[PDB]
Design an enzyme around this catalytic site. Sequence first.
Site, mmCIF file in Angstrom:
data_model
loop_
_atom_site.group_PDB
_atom_site.id
_atom_site.type_symbol
_atom_site.label_atom_id
_atom_site.label_comp_id
_atom_site.label_asym_id
_atom_site.label_seq_id
_atom_site.Cartn_x
_atom_site.Cartn_y
_atom_site.Cartn_z
ATOM 1 N N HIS A 358 0.866 -1.241 -0.043
ATOM 2 C CA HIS A 358 -0.100 0.070 -0.038
ATOM 3 C C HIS A 358 1.441 1.658 0.210
ATOM 4 O O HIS A 358 0.443 2.629 -0.289
ATOM 5 C CB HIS A 358 -0.811 -0.269 1.342
ATOM 6 C CG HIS A 358 -2.041 -1.176 1.772
ATOM 7 N ND1 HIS A 358 -3.938 -0.287 0.602
ATOM 8 C CD2 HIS A 358 -2.081 -2.323 1.697
ATOM 9 C CE1 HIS A 358 -3.979 -1.479 1.028
ATOM 10 N NE2 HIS A 358 -2.778 -2.147 1.134
ATOM 11 N N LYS A 549 -8.378 14.284 4.064
ATOM 12 C CA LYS A 549 -7.496 13.138 4.101
ATOM 13 C C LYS A 549 -6.661 13.452 5.591
ATOM 14 O O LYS A 549 -5.728 14.872 6.023
ATOM 15 C CB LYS A 549 -7.240 13.144 3.121
ATOM 16 C CG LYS A 549 -6.054 14.805 2.353
ATOM 17 C CD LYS A 549 -5.172 14.650 1.251
ATOM 18 C CE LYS A 549 -6.170 14.184 0.178
ATOM 19 N NZ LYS A 549 -6.119 13.127 -1.128
ATOM 20 N N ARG A 550 -6.187 12.020 5.658
ATOM 21 C CA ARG A 550 -4.646 12.756 7.091
ATOM 22 C C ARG A 550 -3.907 13.456 6.723
ATOM 23 O O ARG A 550 -3.169 14.139 5.847
ATOM 24 C CB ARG A 550 -4.302 11.238 7.225
ATOM 25 C CG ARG A 550 -5.293 10.402 7.965
ATOM 26 C CD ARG A 550 -6.240 11.025 9.320
ATOM 27 N NE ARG A 550 -4.508 10.578 10.779
ATOM 28 C CZ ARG A 550 -4.289 9.274 11.134
ATOM 29 N NH1 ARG A 550 -4.923 8.686 11.008
ATOM 30 N NH2 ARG A 550 -2.734 9.870 11.588
ATOM 31 N N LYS A 555 0.930 14.633 1.280
ATOM 32 C CA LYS A 555 0.017 15.137 0.401
ATOM 33 C C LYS A 555 -0.280 16.677 0.745
ATOM 34 O O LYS A 555 -1.552 16.794 -0.599
ATOM 35 C CB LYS A 555 -1.244 14.252 1.288
ATOM 36 C CG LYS A 555 -1.459 13.231 1.670
ATOM 37 C CD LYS A 555 -2.455 13.064 2.367
ATOM 38 C CE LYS A 555 -3.022 10.904 2.950
ATOM 39 N NZ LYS A 555 -3.980 10.260 1.327
ATOM 40 N N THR A 657 -8.519 7.290 -2.699
ATOM 41 C CA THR A 657 -9.544 6.564 -2.227
ATOM 42 C C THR A 657 -10.810 7.903 -2.315
ATOM 43 O O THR A 657 -11.538 8.408 -2.576
ATOM 44 C CB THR A 657 -10.265 5.630 -1.799
ATOM 45 O OG1 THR A 657 -9.850 6.120 -0.273
ATOM 46 C CG2 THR A 657 -9.413 4.245 -2.404
ATOM 47 N N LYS A 661 -14.672 9.170 -4.420
ATOM 48 C CA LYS A 661 -16.041 8.681 -3.552
ATOM 49 C C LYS A 661 -16.004 10.544 -4.011
ATOM 50 O O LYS A 661 -17.199 11.078 -4.481
ATOM 51 C CB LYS A 661 -14.952 9.667 -1.932
ATOM 52 C CG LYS A 661 -14.871 8.040 -1.555
ATOM 53 C CD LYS A 661 -14.292 8.268 -0.126
ATOM 54 C CE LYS A 661 -13.627 7.167 0.396
ATOM 55 N NZ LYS A 661 -12.849 7.743 2.001
HETATM 56 C C1 LIG Z 1 -11.788 7.817 1.875
HETATM 57 C C2 LIG Z 1 -11.375 8.331 3.310
HETATM 58 C C3 LIG Z 1 -9.708 8.368 3.562
HETATM 59 C C4 LIG Z 1 -8.828 8.050 2.278
HETATM 60 O O1 LIG Z 1 -8.823 9.302 1.400
HETATM 61 P P1 LIG Z 1 -7.726 9.807 1.129
HETATM 62 O O2 LIG Z 1 -7.819 11.624 0.136
HETATM 63 O O3 LIG Z 1 -7.096 8.678 0.343
HETATM 64 O O4 LIG Z 1 -6.390 9.695 1.716
HETATM 65 C C5 LIG Z 1 -9.845 8.592 4.589
HETATM 66 N N1 LIG Z 1 -10.020 9.074 6.017
HETATM 67 C C6 LIG Z 1 -11.713 8.866 5.882
HETATM 68 C C7 LIG Z 1 -12.010 9.435 7.225
HETATM 69 C C8 LIG Z 1 -11.967 8.109 4.686
HETATM 70 O O5 LIG Z 1 -13.229 7.804 4.836
HETATM 71 C C1 LIG Z 2 0.466 2.157 4.093
HETATM 72 C C2 LIG Z 2 -1.081 3.076 3.547
HETATM 73 O O1 LIG Z 2 -2.114 3.262 4.929
HETATM 74 N N1 LIG Z 2 -1.291 3.323 2.385
HETATM 75 C C3 LIG Z 2 -2.374 3.531 1.867
HETATM 76 O O2 LIG Z 2 -3.142 3.062 1.784
HETATM 77 C C4 LIG Z 2 -4.498 2.964 0.656
HETATM 78 C C5 LIG Z 2 -5.382 2.255 0.493
HETATM 79 O O3 LIG Z 2 -4.835 0.899 -0.525
HETATM 80 C C6 LIG Z 2 -4.188 3.893 -0.882
HETATM 81 O O4 LIG Z 2 -4.829 4.557 -0.929
HETATM 82 C C7 LIG Z 2 -3.257 5.333 0.052
HETATM 83 O O5 LIG Z 2 -2.995 5.554 -1.349
HETATM 84 C C8 LIG Z 2 -1.726 4.761 0.937
HETATM 85 O O6 LIG Z 2 -1.172 6.129 1.554
#
Ligand SMILES: *Cc1c(COP(=O)(O)O)cnc(C)c1O
Ligand SMILES: CC(=O)N[C@@H]1O[C@H](CO)[C@@H](O)[C@H](O)[C@H]1O
Lengths: 811, 802
Positions: A358, A549-550, A555, A657, A661
Amino acid sequence: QISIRGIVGVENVAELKKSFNRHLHFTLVKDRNVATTRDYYFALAHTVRDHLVGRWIRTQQHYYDKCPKRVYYLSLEFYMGRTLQNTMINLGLQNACDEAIYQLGLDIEELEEIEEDAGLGNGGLGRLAACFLDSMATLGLAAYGYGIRYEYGIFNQKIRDGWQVEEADDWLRYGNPWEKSRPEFMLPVHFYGKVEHTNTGTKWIDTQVVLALPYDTPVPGYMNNTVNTMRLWSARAPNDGDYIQAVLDRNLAENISRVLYPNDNFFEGKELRLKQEYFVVAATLQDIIRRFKASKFGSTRGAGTVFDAFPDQVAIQLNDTHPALAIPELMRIFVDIEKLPWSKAWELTQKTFAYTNHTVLPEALERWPVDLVEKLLPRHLEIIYEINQKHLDRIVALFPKDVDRLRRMSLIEEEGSKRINMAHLCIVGSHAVNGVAKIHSDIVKTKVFKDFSELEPDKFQNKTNGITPRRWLLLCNPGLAELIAEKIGEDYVKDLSQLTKLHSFLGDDVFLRELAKVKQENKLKFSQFLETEYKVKINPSSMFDVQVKRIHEYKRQLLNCLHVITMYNRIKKDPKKLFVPRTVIIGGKAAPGYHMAKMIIKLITSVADVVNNDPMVGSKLKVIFLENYRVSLAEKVIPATDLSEQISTAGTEASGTGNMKFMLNGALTIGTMDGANVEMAEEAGEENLFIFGMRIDDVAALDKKGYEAKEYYEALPELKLVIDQIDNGFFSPKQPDLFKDIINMLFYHDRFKVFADYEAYVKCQDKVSQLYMNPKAWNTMVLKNIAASGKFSSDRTIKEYAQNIWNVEPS
Amino acid sequence: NVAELKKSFNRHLHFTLVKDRNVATTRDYYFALAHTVRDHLVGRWIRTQQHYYDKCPKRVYYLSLEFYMGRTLQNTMINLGLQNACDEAIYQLGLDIEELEEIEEDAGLGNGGLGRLAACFLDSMATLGLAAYGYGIRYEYGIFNQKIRDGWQVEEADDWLRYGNPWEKSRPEFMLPVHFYGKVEHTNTGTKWIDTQVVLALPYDTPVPGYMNNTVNTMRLWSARAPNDFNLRDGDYIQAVLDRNLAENISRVLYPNDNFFEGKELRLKQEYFVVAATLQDIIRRFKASKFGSTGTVFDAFPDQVAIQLNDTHPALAIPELMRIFVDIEKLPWSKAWELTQKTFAYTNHTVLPEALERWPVDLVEKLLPRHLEIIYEINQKHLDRIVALFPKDVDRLRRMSLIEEEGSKRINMAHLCIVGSHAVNGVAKIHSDIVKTKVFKDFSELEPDKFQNKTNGITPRRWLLLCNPGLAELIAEKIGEDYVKDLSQLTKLHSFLGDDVFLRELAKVKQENKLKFSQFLETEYKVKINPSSMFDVQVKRIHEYKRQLLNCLHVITMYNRIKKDPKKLFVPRTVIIGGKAAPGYHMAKMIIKLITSVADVVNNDPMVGSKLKVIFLENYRVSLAEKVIPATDLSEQISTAGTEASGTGNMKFMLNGALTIGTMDGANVEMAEEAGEENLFIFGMRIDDVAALDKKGYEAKEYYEALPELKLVIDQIDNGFFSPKQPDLFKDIINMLFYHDRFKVFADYEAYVKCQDKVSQLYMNPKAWNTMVLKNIAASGKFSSDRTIKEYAQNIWNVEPS
Ligand SMILES: *Cc1c(COP(=O)(O)O)cnc(C)c1O
Ligand SMILES: CC(=O)N[C@@H]1O[C@H](CO)[C@@H](O)[C@H](O)[C@H]1O
Ligand SMILES: Cc1cc(C)c(NC(=O)Nc2cc3ccccc3cc2C(=O)N[C@H](C(=O)O)[C@@H](C)OC(C)(C)C)c(C)c1
Ligand SMILES: Cc1cc(C)c(NC(=O)Nc2cc3ccccc3cc2C(=O)N[C@H](C(=O)O)[C@@H](C)OC(C)(C)C)c(C)c1
Ligand SMILES: Cc1cc(C)c(NC(=O)Nc2cc3ccccc3cc2C(=O)N[C@H](C(=O)O)[C@@H](C)OC(C)(C)C)c(C)c1
Ligand SMILES: *Cc1c(COP(=O)(O)O)cnc(C)c1O
Ligand SMILES: CC(=O)N[C@@H]1O[C@H](CO)[C@@H](O)[C@H](O)[C@H]1O
Ligand SMILES: Cn1c(=O)c2c(ncn2C)n(C)c1=O
Ligand SMILES: Cn1c(=O)c2c(ncn2C)n(C)c1=O
């Protein structure tokens, strides 16, 4: 779904009301005169759970009777969110329950809002597991998720004096109506001790024991007869100085499942984390083997239980390297306990396991010190050394003269403190290895694990991530789901590629208006929320520009912040000039030990305070740091979004992901060619996304030449102003030196090259503003994104895992 | 009724346990039945709460650190009248209800008599229709499970909640904050207790069904939880989350001491925890009541609330109520103090000095600084009155102070309870008299009417209908079932004296009980039990004062008599001794090892054979008491005169058809008053005889030298006869017996053995034995806890049965 009108439909609602009242009375033990909203939530939750029990039991019976090959999704994280509405929808019960609750004089939204998130994950990795469970159930696969029942999930985030503070996520305080404790199925897990090599063979002795007690949560398929299981383990002391202290010290065993490690894409080599990883693996493998032995494929010969058919009946997917210890644990069970010959056991092991990678960020890579593993898991260290020895013997035979190749391919990193490369362990112990988007899977195969892929070409695969359109459209955006259904029917839910039928409404002014109306309704609803939580007056005609996102350097929330300040400075410079109004929302949790992420949050809230309160700006621009971003809040903000920020440095975001969304829910995307952003551009057409910045080869060139941040600073006047303001105290007048660490990072240690993408980013943003002023062209581009989002259903993803990795069929 | 019970069972197995019958466990069936039964009392539980709200009866709150409740399934079925229908339903489902019943863990949230009294009282108060709640702590681990390993006690954690508890309902919505540590400021808007640490008290509610009525009262037990809110005064994130364990440790485990004070800070935290949560809950309920609307609303508080303090363990309730009234509700001290005294009553359960709670002032100052201030002020106003009445009596101030000044300063919690309560009671006539006229003489002289007696009792639901259905049925067939709610009706059985048909029926019930318990014994211990032997039983916590050791000397005496003359007539016995030792109690643990050592020799000597078998009955607890008591012929109640405040095991045995060998101690004296002294086997020194020997001085050696049989027993113990691989194993016991025996074991040995000889004589005459048994059962009515509760209600709480 279940009908509410007519003879039978009236009785359906009548039964639901009767069951609700029975639960309030007998289960909650409350008279209606003293009941609260929370009691009503629990009464409804029990009523809904009762409705899937028949299928849950029958699903278990079916898997026993017909022996389909089982898929076990082994993960340290399941980021499930709330369960009530998802369950009602998947069971076809939402309309009937809605009606029952309405007739009882109650507000269904209020009941639904009482439920705590099951926040047993950090972000995308944990949420992928959750989407996968929904898709696997919807496709009828014999699949269980196995994880840890953390007493505390991802911390609850508050902001105090502009900084993140953490509170314990006490999600079980009022109980969890969606789990069934099953202590009869408890299993022992061993730690510490030592290895003895005697006449009877290798024994792992003098160990400490911790019990693993499972809790089962139902996983309902969408509109089918399948109810799968998520089985989560909780740690307990065995029942077998100061008596009192001995009893209190039972807490130490129970600490194993106490709390989720709150790190996203970051490795922390703590002993307690290693214990968690072995705990989930040991309990899970014992359970899987127990089920196999009880099955119709269970049989015994002179040499004991026959495991020849084990990988014909069992697939175990390793979600990242976190459960990598499953490989040596299965070998330990096969060789030490079942007495299989090593060669046969290793063959069965490889056929059982597949590994999903990942991330390629170095700081996320699990490299456990050998001395820690020796102390905690001495037999697993021996087994890992033996795997490595036989692995390297093969490499020497193939490449006699290549000494460096042995070093590169070893499971052991020998320099200074010796460490175990868990990714290498996962590669050699699995029959398939996959990345999570085309760009990432290619890097994994051809760069990071080049030496491995050359020797085993067909081992390495791609499986592009996906999201479930149940939670992420039908549930979170009923307005859009309804509009789509009115125009193209309801078959898209199970086959999302049918969204391409929306192309029939290109140039249809009525539809483009209806689409905009849905977005507006979502924006108004979310704006209500914002104005009750934050001191801000939201401009309802503003573009909702959202990055959730985190919080991470990779990012690049920081890049977004530079653009916010740039917009601010343009307004102050030319007050009368045309400005396309925005509400800029940035949200996400910082890992508690991540200093730079915490500084970035403080920068954002500091900028927000200046921007929001400057009377010369007013309704042109407002900034919100969205607190406590998590699954249930994602369901609220994503449908309200116009512009989705997906701006990671090319090569850093394995897939993403959130991006998917936003695409499914009617937002346009500003982003780099990174992760699945590339595939979103492929599906919708690159001209229908706002793509900008360095691509992976441009980043590589800049790395070769050497990155000099100062050159961009000196060359770009608008950037210079932003940086000087931050550095000189414009955004922290009471503490002028507050952002020193950010400035130092940006100029001398920026691995993610913020300044190098600034110019392109700001130019791209200007194009976004221009398009937003033309609603017809804006919503035409939206239509083209929604209509091309079908590839990103996790149903598609799961079908590909099923066909090419697990060897199972949708049923 | 049966058809619907079966349907309900099946629905719970399916929907509640989420199990197909083909993979169900015996435990699943127990839980399905438990939920089915609980469902039957929910209507009355809710309607009882409504009724108390609607009609505002004065409420009784029984505040205790212990509730020794045992199992709940059978008790609930009996009180709701469902036992026969459930047995049939379960039978029709192919199962055995008795097997399901054995799955249930005891709620062992007590040590012994004190905790069991609270449990009997809850049943009695519900049966009498009083508006009563029990308030205590939901310990995650109750009294430890006792194993015997190589003849020694070993302790295992009592993980009673592992599979859940179907007889509680969690109510986190009613959580209340409890404060610790911090500091005090005396401001111009009142005294503020600030900068405290907070622990949350989460209540769990268990239903308490009355016997065959419409009342279901509540036992509300508090569990500790860490608070969640961020405090600006707030390191490693992970460690901070783990450290939530520290607050949660407050309700982790019951302190396993019986009649023994251990001044541990965690125990002090437990005491304040239960007190602060309970009082807060009582006041919330009061303010929400119809009497909450009204010069202050609290003028009616003692007309609407009685709080009973079970021993001094919840003594802090007194200063806590003052703190709430004064600091929070803004009442003047004088008014608050008036209301406080009228609210509280205190029950004293022992005069043994090692049991007395005396908390160091520095410990209380640190943990509860505002309570120390309030206790000092209570004491000041107390001593001011004493000085006013006795200006020349300087030593009287010292004697009556709540503070002991001798070196390490300590708070006398009994003194606090006396001054802050309107009534003080002991638990049997002999004890209540000692409490009033000796121990607290200075207090009773100033306030005569404060001190009362309330002789203890036992519930005849658990301790007759449940544990001994054959005896209950036999009594009911003769005199009807009015005795269950008025046990004094057992006097009607006197008319069956001389009815040899009835006496045989009575004997047959005992015999059936013995056969069943013999099966248990042979299953658990693999010793061959003689069916015709007298079952001679001493079950109670292991204590020097209870004198299991004296019993052991008699066992060895019998063994030696058999070995000396094997042809001589010997009335066979099965001698059963059981009970837990507090883990830190060395001498109790040595006594257990002596008993198991003696048993090993006696049971395996081929010269003895079926004449004598000895069992150390392991893991003695409420559910096991229900098995052994009905099977008993001779009940051992042999504490040194003046040491057992009352006893309640004694009453259980009397109700169930055992004869009693015992001293004139505690309620044994009243058992003799009721049944006639000649119908008990009374022996040994009386309380005045013990005092005379104390005056003279006790020299144990003199008895050893004068009594040949004692000498042999002691020399055998002393020289390794019962521990050949460890000849000096019992040195500590021997040293104690000769030089430090506060309970005068040797001084009662001769009278004890002579008394035991008379028991054997009577056992050879079944008509005479069963005649005496009938006189005991027919005179046991006084010892119903219904009688006890009626007296508390009339003379202390001022409430009427309904
Ligand atoms: C979908 C989701 C993420 C993943 O988001 P990315 O922008 O792809 O890093 C992280 N936290 C929550 C609560 C989510 O629903
Ligand atoms: C180690 C880890 O949390 N990796 C994360 O995994 C998700 C689900 O595959 C990816 O969408 C994302 O880009 C990536 O940062
Ligand atoms: C201990 C307990 C036992 C039960 C059966 C319940 N459930 C329940 O329905 N109780 C009540 C029903 C009522 C019906 C009509 C009128 C009044 C009723 C009151 C209760 C009840 O138990 N009242 C509660 C009580 O007395 O503790 C709480 C809710 O009231 C206060 C917060 C003021 C203390 C509750 C809530 C607590
Ligand atoms: C995860 C889970 C889910 C459910 C719904 C249940 N309850 C249940 O009734 N399950 C089963 C019903 C069956 C009915 C007919 C035939 C077979 C059935 C099997 C189950 C079932 O879940 N079997 C369990 C399982 O597969 O984990 C246990 C009992 O079997 C093993 C110990 C061998 C692993 C159970 C027990 C576990
Ligand atoms: C020979 C013999 C036979 C039997 C069945 C027994 N068992 C036994 O306990 N029998 C009796 C039980 C009684 C129960 C209640 C009331 C009277 C009972 C009488 C007997 C019984 O058999 N009584 C005998 C009898 O009447 O001759 C002997 C034992 O009594 C004397 C010693 C006084 C002579 C005994 C003890 C001896
Ligand atoms: C009744 C009982 C007691 C009290 O027994 P005493 O002989 O009066 O000390 C102690 N433990 C249990 C389990 C009981 O049932
Ligand atoms: C402090 C304590 O546990 N005391 C015990 O209380 C019970 C119940 O009153 C008495 O029967 C018993 O004699 C006495 O030892
Ligand atoms: C330096 N650093 C951290 O220290 C960190 C982190 N995530 C959690 N922590 C503690 N990340 C992503 C990180 O780059
Ligand atoms: C000396 N001692 C103890 O040490 C003890 C005890 N009960 C528990 N403990 C530890 N008793 C009754 C006792 O007399």
